[PDB]
Amino acid sequence: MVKVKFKYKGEEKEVDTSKIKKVWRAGKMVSFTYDDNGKTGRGAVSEKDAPKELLDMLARAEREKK
DNA sequence: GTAATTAC
């Protein structure tokens, strides 16, 4: 149960890392997609506000040989 | 404006 909190378009949001589908990084910004109920949602946070679990998902994505 | 990527 790792909850990621962030604001996207004025709206404050929470998402469990298990619903996160993809994670990448642009500079110091960590952006991702997640399975919103039915549709695919977006969110991003500062590296410094990222919980280790999210950063590990990022580190694995970088090593994916596919 | 660019970074990486997406949903719209």
Next chain:
DNA sequence: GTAATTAC
């Protein structure tokens, strides 16, 4: 084609 996200 572009708004959206954090930093530069």
